[PDB]
Design a protein around this ligand. Structure first.
Ligand SMILES: Nc1ncnc2c1ncn2[C@@H]1O[C@H](CSCC[C@H](N)C(=O)O)[C@@H](O)[C@H]1O
Length: 170
């Protein structure tokens, strides 16, 4: 029912190995969403589709900006899964029409995803920066795209709590 968007921002700024890991995690994110309830990939260029070893027919890919995709569907506010926020994702945010997970990997961590929110705000989009915590700290929370998507799904679909959802995906 809602939109799980993967923001392929910073795509051409990653190495070939890192590009493959992003395409792998998006593939695993689809198969995970396949066993639940819808997966969107913005900034989805030709190279991503070339590296995506899954069915392009089964997901929604848009080569343009994420903000354009949100406007083209009437969505004015989203939830940005961001480990750098100070407010934690709660059931009060399960009413938004789209959840955004930035297609980002690491090699040591940097502070990248809040720039996606700054870009969405500059395009006139209400953004709810929400962090996923385990016992108050983000340490121990798996930060892979497919793991983050699974944590949210166990909370929305299966009604688990955040601590239970994080540990089961951990
Ligand atoms: N603790 C957390 N809470 C919410 N989202 C998280 C998260 N950990 C990882 N993610 C999601 O997983 C994606 C890639 S992990 C992000 C890598 C980098 N260290 C950074 O934070 O910028 C991000 O887009 C983010 O939305």
């Amino acid at each position: 029912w809602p939109y799980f968007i993967i923001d392929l921002y910073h795509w051409d700024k990653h190495t070939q190995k890192e590009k493959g890991k992003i395409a792998l995690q998006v593939n695993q994110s689809y198969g995970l969403l396949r066993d639940y309830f819808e997966l969107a990939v913005t900034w989805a260029n030709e190279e991503f589709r070339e590296m995506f070893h899954g069915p392009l027919d089964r997901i929604t890919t848009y080569g343009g900006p994420t903000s354009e995709f949100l406007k083209e569907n009437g969505i004015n506010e989203v939830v940005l899964l961001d480990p750098w926020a100070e407010e934690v994702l709660s059931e009060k945010d399960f009413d938004v029409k789209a959840f955004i997970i930035g297609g980002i990997v690491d090699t040591n961590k940097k502070k990248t995803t809040p720039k996606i929110g700054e870009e969405l705000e500059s395009a006139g989009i209400k953004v709810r920066r929400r962090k996923i915590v385990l016992r108050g700290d983000v340490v121990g929370v798996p930060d892979r795209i497919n793991r983050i998507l699974g944590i949210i799904l166990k909370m929305m679909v299966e009604g688990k709590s955040m601590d239970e959802a994080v540990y089961e995906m951990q």
